[model samples]
Target chain A: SMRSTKVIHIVGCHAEGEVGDVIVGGVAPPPGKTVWEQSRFIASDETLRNFVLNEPRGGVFRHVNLLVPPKDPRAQMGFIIMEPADTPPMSGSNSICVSTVLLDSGIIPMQEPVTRMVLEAPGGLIEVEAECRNGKAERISVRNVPSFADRLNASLEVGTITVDTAYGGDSFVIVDAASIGMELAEIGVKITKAANEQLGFRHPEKDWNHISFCQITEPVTRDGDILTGVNTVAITGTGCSARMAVLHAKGQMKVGERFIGHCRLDKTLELGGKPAISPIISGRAWVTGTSQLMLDPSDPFPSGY
Target chain B: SMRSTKVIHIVGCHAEGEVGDVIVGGVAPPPGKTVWEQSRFIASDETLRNFVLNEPRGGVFRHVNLLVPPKDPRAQMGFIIMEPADTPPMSGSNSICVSTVLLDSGIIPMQEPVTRMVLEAPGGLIEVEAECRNGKAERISVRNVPSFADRLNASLEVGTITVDTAYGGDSFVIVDAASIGMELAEIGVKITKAANEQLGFRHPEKDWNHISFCQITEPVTRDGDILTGVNTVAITGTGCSARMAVLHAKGQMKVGERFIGHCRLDKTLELGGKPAISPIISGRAWVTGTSQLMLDPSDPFPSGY
Candidate 1:
């Protein structure tokens, strides 16, 4: 029965906050353990892709929880969050899902109002707070202590152009999405093309590398408080890479309580209150949602360790 | 007088497969040659976000033409390519735009039913054929030599999951976009969050890198041809990459064919393609469109020289 009973259960973080304690459990292992030591983390790409993109068990848009051990020593919970493409580190909305699952599954005792917790992600440490009601966490808010930019202006070469770069966790090349006189859909296509070309462009002697990350963010209103939408573009080279994220803002936008208009508004306020806005280059993590825990007899090292 | 001119003119590409040409005398050079040189081969991020995204000349989804020198020594003609996010590369649709511009400006002579021409791009050399009628190049068709996958079945340590790695100019940890079960739109948002976190995730000692590119390509049926639409998740690395093209059967989807479809079928085909579908690793140019001449400053130096 060892073969049948050799299932490995990994833990996934759902929600955490001040009033209630953090909860974790799933097909993943407990925090601080490697994914390879977990069983449920391994699944064929086809099967996993089908499950995530299909319906019922997964929605065309539902998020999945992947529990893993933290690479950090201080953290007790780690996650490998899965989406359609790949796994992510910290997600505000998914945090809610994880928290809800935890409370409902009795992984954590039911708490009231809010529960505060810290999650170790591939990106870094994310602090999350979950709002619970009826023994279930409903809404979640995350404090993304993004790597703040110390410099306001940064420049890099993309294709033949030297671009002034900024950051919001991801690197962006701010564009006046309105200047080209196009709509979001059209802009999306155009930006995608440009970002790709820039990333692909290479030089003979000097690898005038192309940009892998490209996004178009525009201002929705003259008031600085709101951003229309962010279009992201990514480019990858052999081992090196470059990306651009476009942040669009209204002409005269407000920051904090003050109406900081264009040319007058501080750039830091536009990007989640960071002092400088540069690409937040950090480590990479592969997040996955485990469905079933299976033991590998030969390796015996779970799946994603 | 040149200062008063806002639009830059471009020329030279015949339907007879002749070498292309370009010109850029309309506007005065910027503050310095660096500005002029930089302005010529400007990236889509700079052009779209700075120039096009701004008020006077552009909007959210507008397009712009840049006059730059060719990076190739064999390139017969200089070009004025359209950049949406300051990106310069070829595309099925952009080829049409370049051909139309050449024809409309009398730079390229329109011949019979079809015309063939070669043009340079940031990605590399792209071959193009256009349909001409009434002295105008109406539609352009591009033949991408062929795309080969690199690193088939290659496994990557992503977050807590071991993912199959593939390269199409950029490295992608190809996974089923449906795994999360969220709709495409919702998937985009969630993936964006995950990508951001992943990009931010740091390696304690090894410096685990973030993904430079993220795209969700799904299979779809368009006019009976299997197609794939790559919804880009993120591009934070380097290279002038293009939108992942959906390789479909000829006559399946004609020019100007637009519809939303999944790329799953395409993936299956790719997996079974001749030469075997190995994971893409090395960098290769994926053709999309021809670069036309625009804003050539008559300087002797080549672009990026």
Candidate 2:
């Protein structure tokens, strides 16, 4: 009764569709603790994630990123990533989101033409480069983890139908409705369930890990530019997460428009060059909007944007 | 970069056996609406529940309780309860906890010797009375939802021992360790796993419901009073809730000390009474501790105790 109220400020943003992220810029972790110790407060606690990514305040399609000063010696900043279920090891989407926020949210001042920064992430150091125009950020790109095809054309049976699997950050079992009996949503369940039941996908080196998602690819064109359609759903998280995962498993790379704002994001990936390493993808994330996340230490869940 | 902070006050609590339950007492929803709309924020969003009941702000063994002006006209308060898992229909232990806070938390003026209030819960209206002393609530007892035995002593084979099913709020199959070759935690996993694999329980009337948990009963003494040893884990919620269910499954009432505090909380239960639509069990809950939960709107997890 004698205590004063508490306050926090949060800035929200998104990358491609509705995989949302958060920028917690002004707070610092206590001494003898790393910056992640502050952000991990959200990763390890679902209550914190809910405020930023679920019901009353957030959507089911949301994922959140907490920005902190770097813990890694060579990084300019630090971050930890989270989805509805758990914090992920690495992501092509959330990185674009973090870079978008840093270049434009005034978390960092804008440069004349371009800005570059290195961030320490749970996965590794992420190099972000953004195009600036008149003190505003235009397009942001991130040099993400080295992603490659773990097994190209790896096929498995899904109730008499064959599906192919490939590694892209996580994994994706490719599907085409035209070559199948029904839509990806209809077949998506059968294939994913098969991954759990009849056929299983495992990491090349890691134990207790397996294929992470399934994708349905199609062909599409926008503004006369030919672009590939890529719709994918994460293999895990809540049912809400899977719903969008299935939706994402099928969208086209568009042109002459805000790609992230378009119906399936046009993921600008660069899965090329050498294995001893190069970027797997490059993309842009935009600031959708901002909100004042409120908190009072007295309510069960009181703050977060 | 340019933003103001926000604050909220949340009262945190724990019961049964975990750092469970948050008391959001200083609020009410509009007429024609319900308090569930406020705390239901967590119910609608699993992310919020995780923040309050997981590591960092909460733990693997925590749950939360939200207090609002009652939805039912005859009640004094309303609440929606949860764990890391889901919203339960009703709970006797959590009711005692709500009553304890209502009688002494300064949110409600302390009354000498006794205090009473009606809480409109999801299951039904709960009547609670507490013993007050020196401006503090010492003991609280709740007249809970009418609990009844659904299938008493319905035996089933679990490895080498026989487990009898009992309905005490949720369905639990009781096992005697004397006849088993393992701990409650061990035998529990086996039977519940069997339920999932074969002989799955589908509640006869409820569309999406079934048998919920498993319990191991034994013997123990607390504060020189003989009591039942209930080593139980909830079929859901948090680890703390599981610790108390079996204790109350069987106990001889005691006094002069917090029995729930002694040797794994053997919850004393009274399952016998007149049934003109009245409750079949009664028990006590006492305040554990108080702390000021500091929340910053700037943090990713903006609002929660």
Candidate 3:
């Protein structure tokens, strides 16, 4: 005598300030040989996305990751990240969340001291290092995609403010936030749109174009070899990569020095001997709870409102 | 090796479009002789509220209810409702959600076809009648607090529109809403504040004042004896009562007629030889998931940001 048409198992979690829940079961893997193709299938189909991301079940501040079988032989697990807007190729906070949920829930084995693993995302296979002790994943650090400064000290009118442009996996319009008492998220959205229009970006070798994020930077405090600062949005792994590249381009940082905030940058690489960063963004996530999400046969907003 | 300082159990649910999750366990009941006192204790303490209601755990669109032992013997259960803003006396959507969770989770015995139960809320005792079948609480209806029209067709200027004011459980500024493509919630807040100032309300015999809600009503369509209409906000039980009273006062409705939208009002009462309504607001709720919220010892914002 059950009324449910479907039941999805989820482990509630958060990385820093972001809610990045994981869907562990109750959905079949999309038809694809690669994780990227699987991501595209979900994006094009959109039924699962709408069902999990819309109101009565999810909100704008939430992101969900669907666990799928790994396509790469080197990776132990693969997941498709679902944001409120789209099924993005990758997300920093979401990766951290996925790692934590994996270890803490015993879906993936946890080893004391450090557990090194590889995860396949739509963006690509990622190297992950989790600091574990007492059965908890205390911190998760993932090596980000190659990132570099596209333009430094670019002047774009947002009625107007000085900005910097960079590609850290996803493109960003970096601002020195003297900041707001207003709707910062709304303003950030507008700034992102304007930044995309006036000061456009295109990856020298990839299909990447336009700025997709607005990162508000604060003053970085020097503590010898480490640079630390606060920012508005939680530092995404890729955003951290872009920040490192931009700072290096501005001569404030070097090849080996680390930057610490809510995130970290622990490695660097060279692109034609020009400094590029392979950021290792690290953060912690906790297992909030496990749930069996049910859909009633007679429910009106089966996909949510 | 657990790092969490607290473990709270929760059942995620939604009534109509609103999230009204229920706290089933993991915190001790506060010291109170009545549910109202318990709600006040929570309001004054605020630790639990901040922990469960803030970002990383909750959002502005959510409401949480804590199950407690009933002070009244006539009631099977008792609860305190927590909104993002404050601990209010009662809420209609929240009540329906609580009833559904209670019945569906097997916390209370669910009877097929109909299950009659009484719950003690901070405001008063709530009589709940749930339509159950196939082990699901298909619909839940609660008898709301007495509602009456305060001022009908009152002219107010905000640059402004004519309005109708009424006391359901909470006061409301009913706008015929030609509506907005703008931030309706923000505009509603401003309208609520303005309504509180210009057309302040005081209970005829009790201590209540100010408009706490804004209901944007569309035109009602008559389907024989039933009146149906669309509204921006989901109808709360008390709000339904107020609307029924206002509609009757406007000569558009009378005793024994039902109002159906996302909610329902199937009952009426007589007060001092005038028509007053004891709205039987009914709606459906589904169990989204269950969560065990945790707090890590090393988590920076233990109470949440």
Candidate 4:
């Protein structure tokens, strides 16, 4: 039989686009308010479905983290679910959030100078190094594989708009703010509204039902430097198709920055950081607190549970 | 006094579809073959010039790689020269080739199960794990970071052609091979030729030169599974323009089953691998040769002494 573990919620905004609400819920053991160290096994479909599709709390569009015992001596295991997407890989943002919650809650004993912890997410096992000062994690650095461009100068046609696209850590639609007839600050909101109309709640195709966030970044200037006041928009989905659309968009937007937006249909949106905003969009949502701890065998859980 | 390292020759192909001869004079120390375990430094200019300008071995429009010692403890470093027309960051093909040379030559000790090495290239540091059995290395797998789609359904008009661009690992001009009036094999040659002509001996125009490679893949089929009968023609360039082209390409190719053919300006026809056959056509060039190590450092004089 499976035993229940303590649960906590950490809310924040996914930086892909403007601020949106992102709620991360998971079981945390005693001595740790954030479940960065606890390891739990998700054996049945009921648990998976509940954590991924349960009402107000769990759904296909939200992100979930489940703390469980360590399978190896070096790290603790975690089951992370990004609604509409399942990635068994490591992400920088997710690691930072998980670490912050773990250290703040004291699930693992704090060490002087730096605190080291290995975390297993849907992606893979990732090692994290955090600098702690006065019981607070001052700075956190994650050692992750470097990201590089896969292709260049790809051309696509969407409707009548011509665009160029590229791939970064994920596929992204590269659009110059000027092409959309607006600057970063002014056009961000406009693009956000357009994306909402086309992507929010309603799935663009059957695949884009859970897309709830959009990210925009500054464009690179003619001199090759990233332009100031440019925003890169990241839109996330709750279903495979939503993610797929985003991937497709990234492929289509490969023309000069002024081309129409690309449609990327097969990629994932990674959410990290703590702020009052939805993981999909900028809104009222914040990561309140977090904690970490080790699991005890005596706890009311099954063996290897 | 700085010691001269082993000289490796590279040849470049121009945009006009002209193939140049080998141009070789200077060479850098092979990675892990030098005395400095953590002080390997490669001048970008020297590396690029050797691979691009040297006679039949190289041209202005080409990409090349030179192995050198690492300044860090991780592993050896590969100094890559992006052509005046192309720039690619993380290339699976290049990694495979570099690893093959590094391991075969015994520059680094090969371990059982798999050999782990860290490679520093133009883009950044990449971790590579290769399966080594006996003396040969096969099935190299690199754990890549998450790739997302940036946009979907954008269009562009280049000259008389209207093309859709997508970003995968690099920027690509995505179009149906049929649109170019050619089959997959035929289109591969034509596109490669055109790209070579456009990316000729001269440095790529700021915007036009930002393409890393061109990929041709089968359009979405009815069954939903992506067709694997695709081909990628990787273009190489250097400096800021090279990086931009790669970044541009990545934004265009979304996630999917795609074939990649890396075009290195530094490779020579005389080298084991197949160099570009025509100055205008893009096709696969296979180089065959066993990497031999200079066991006795004293065997050679001046060069790599």
Candidate 5:
């Protein structure tokens, strides 16, 4: 008289246009002392990853975050982000979704006007400030990792297109949309492949050694102390910070400036007095639904297809 | 503080590899005298379709079924199938999913070994036989609409490929995979377009005027009395019936013969003494999960993106 062999509880959400569904329950945390260790444990053991990320149960378009007990003493909660290809330490869209889901589901108590909380990602601790009114977290402000410009006017072999290289949280290959004779729609893979071939990256302090994203942007419109622009690619938090760093390096932006209404470079210092931009990415997220995913024992794809 | 502007309840299920999520609650039924009228009303009014079928709430790979009170006196339940592109009149996978959800959710009482029920699709009534044990609908056997061969040895200009055309509630263009020098993986849209251009269809009595499906099949292997074959395309119920009709036309199948272990022509007779197949399509389904989908009022995409 049973319909399910296993069940998983999920809170579905989307930050901007990307899906960042959160698993609230029905999964045991992998063995590790820190969140990063747990993430690595899951990466080495493919069981839970394949079960939720593969088709029939999940899709390639969405990313899932596993909520766990915080390993850091300064944080109240922890999470491990799971992408379709590989897991990442931190993601802007995913963090917004996790924050929204936590507040919406009452996993964390909601405070009126503003709610200040700290969340632990696999990468490190995150400071979160959510604007709240009438039961909704209207907007979430996330303090992301420091970002800096890597190279400027870098020429790539793909038609010799000039590009700007930077590190938000991940490496990025920035291009001018107009120079490519097209807008940044459906040309991501084409440019991403070319950028990887000619202008690859290796993070100075991390294990990452590839161009993680390709951002094609329109000309920035400056209005008073703020700059606005539009672009594509998934990492909005990192992308915003990285763009700010590039603009600062090019003398187009300065300290305490806001760009695209998403990032504000408040400080211009990192370790050893090195210049970097610590930007706060603010975005809104909506709770799509709550789900109870199940597996039928008799089914062939025990994990997922 | 609340996060959701609107809430919708769903029962997620999959028949074979196809996802057919059911809308169990939160949607008001459209005004109509019959199920067909209701389907048409929703088709003309695009709000509900876009709200549930578009991004964030749904995906292109999944279909949603809205359950309503039966308009037909002979049936216990009724549903309108919403596909990604259109609201199909009837679907085999969707029917299995709807039946599984109904029994699994206890909307319809499950009788021990077997449960017989009638469900009304937009097209017409469907007789359903579900194998049940230990509170699970192990398998579903659906009596599909009469299917008949429209053309035999029909030559299409898609590289001069010889094809068999049939109607099993919907139109199908059947092709032998090996003859096309490739297996039927990722070649659906290519063949579907070519078949539609070269061998278009217009129902003799209905408004359906296009080839709806392209099925690529491998050679059938017969072991004793049962025949088995694997193929591609989404319409398993109609595809199975359509293949039986073509086989009967080619003197390859007879009454009471089962093909591919899915379709069995029980008795073959139609109006005016014309030969037709009333095949029973038997398949398995699994209940994936239940969901509560919501919308935020401030969300820019009120419908979906």
Candidate 6:
């Protein structure tokens, strides 16, 4: 016996080189579920996440993003990022993949030059602008929610890592790529393994772990306040939480532009602020690949939570 | 789109504490294919072993036995033991489970007193004698292949353990439960984990890791050479080759009969000198609940590898 459940997965190099995300559509919890509720639904439930991301299906490193009909009828869509470890509230690259799918994933098509859409995530709403040609969405600019440095110079040694924690759509610790061998590969998994056993971060207000993503950075330049053209790697949706430690420790500063240069498997971004009671981060995302993900409930682990 | 695959999983506690095995059927490789060649098919593989036994589908303590048509015509069936960590070639409890499935799960009815069958495994063919009641196979006496000893007193430091490597159908490291808290519970998992990361064992002739089962022993009595009842927690799959490591290594003589002392997880027996060229341990199986496992290729990890 089974229920009809189908999902479509779109892969995208929203970041470059080694950064990628699997954006999915089909299943979603009701709009009002709590963070813990959503967490258990996907993480503790089991089989689903393992099926789509673990060995034999997707590779060991592929992180999946489940997109739902936007809770707000006008916003467009909703998203939840799933990985081998945890289901993060949102993802920068995944957002771009979702937007790209919106235009060219066969659900809809776009104009030749530009198109726009807004997405809702557990964290917040995301605004997107896509550059299209030949009916494919090539590049995308995202005016993500208020993102800012929680601790521009914060450091922690839960594991061997440089910690500049920030909230850019989701929590991240901006570390240098040199500090850790950054392949998301077998060798690179040690960083995650180390942190998993050691670090435990859960931000009370954000209802997310302290550092959801670890943005491995090699600071090469700074135009105004943005770190630009630098090799960056963000280990995201890591099951370990406790991310907002620095945000609670350090207060915000009056700043100009900031850059978080991360690229495909990728990408570019601008930073400046209204310097309000809140902040947001901006980045560009490129659509990856789109393919339908069909599932049967009889197989088990519907949500893996 | 999917190929036709049907799997029926019948769970029963041939060994106790609700401890049981899932007997699976449907497809297996042709007799001529090698393990690696066969490895490519639905699983026709292993450790995709850990998936079915670990979280999501099963649990931490589940050990599943897959029943396939034997490669040999002389043997009535074939068995593959699955755990969260290893796909042992054979198991005492699991054999009981498979035997229980063979008669009570459907195909055949248990004879009033004794029914016989031969089961083949990668290790060798196992001869079985079943006692029946109420149309069910109550107890099975298996004339398993030769059971012998390996490095009887060999001990390693993965953790504090008593090692008496033996082959009682499959390779077993009869550990002294006296050395550690042996519940096949939390503390027991450490041994498996330590070996998982640090130990690697596969006998040249066995094609299996050195010690698939760790039979934790607490002996109490002996009739001639067997210690009839002992608290034994054997991490099993025990391929046939060597067993009696402790008896030989420790030089125990003038002892009596020994019962592994594990049951509900129900357990059986026989002894003789025609003992052939090798010794085969014996046990009985009980049919518990008969259930079904429905599957579809559309899902990931089909056949759970």
Most TM-score-accurate candidate: 5
Best by lDDT: 5
The clash count of every prediction, one per candidate, is 156, 50, 1, 196, 4, 88
Taking all chains together, each candidate's TM-score versus the true structure is 0.32, 0.46, 0.82, 0.30, 0.85, 0.48
Whole-model lDDT, model 6: 0.48
**Where in model 3 is the C-alpha error above 4 Å?**
A150-165, A173-211, A214-235, A250-252, A260-275, B110-112, B150-165, B173-191, B194-211, B214-235, B249-252, B260-275
The digit string of per-residue lDDT tens for model 1 on A1-305 reads: 01222333332222221111121332434333443222123222333334322321222233455556666666556655555433333344444455444544555565678766666654456655666665545455444423222222233233232233333322334344444433455544445455445433322222123332344434433334532333334331000011112222212223221221101122232324423211211111111112223322322222211
Leading candidate by DockQ: 5
Candidate 6 residues lying further than 4 Å off, grouped into runs, are A1-28, A31-68, A75-77, A82-87, A92-119, A126-146, A154-163, A173-305, B1-68, B74-76, B79-88, B92-119, B126-146, B151-163, B172-305
How far off is residue A278 in model 1, in Å?
A: 46
- Tell me the spans in candidate 5 whose CA falls farther than 4 Å from its real position: A150-165, A173-235, A250-252, A271-274, B3-5, B151-165, B173-211, B214-235, B271-274
Instruction: Report the alpha-carbon TM-score of model 6 versus the true structure.
Output: 0.48
Alpha-carbon local distance difference test for all models: 0.34, 0.49, 0.79, 0.35, 0.80, 0.48
Could you give the C-alpha RMSD of every candidate to the true structure, in order shown? 27.4, 11.9, 4.5, 26.4, 4.1, 10.9
Reference interface contacts recovered per candidate: 0.00, 0.03, 0.45, 0.00, 0.57, 0.00
- Write one digit per residue (lDDT tens) for candidate 2, span B120-164: 776567677776766656556565554433343344555544554
lDDT of 3 at B132: 91
- Winner on DockQ between 1 and 6 is 6
lDDT of 4 by residue, B1-305 (tens): 00112333322111112122112224555344432221123332344443233321222333444454454456466434233343344344444545544554465678876888787654445566767766555435443211112222333323344333332234454445566544455554455455445432111111223333455544432223222233334332111112222222344222232222222111112211211110110121111211111111221211110
- Report the lDDT of model 1 for residue A297: 32
lDDT ranking, high to low: 5, 3, 2, 6, 4, 1
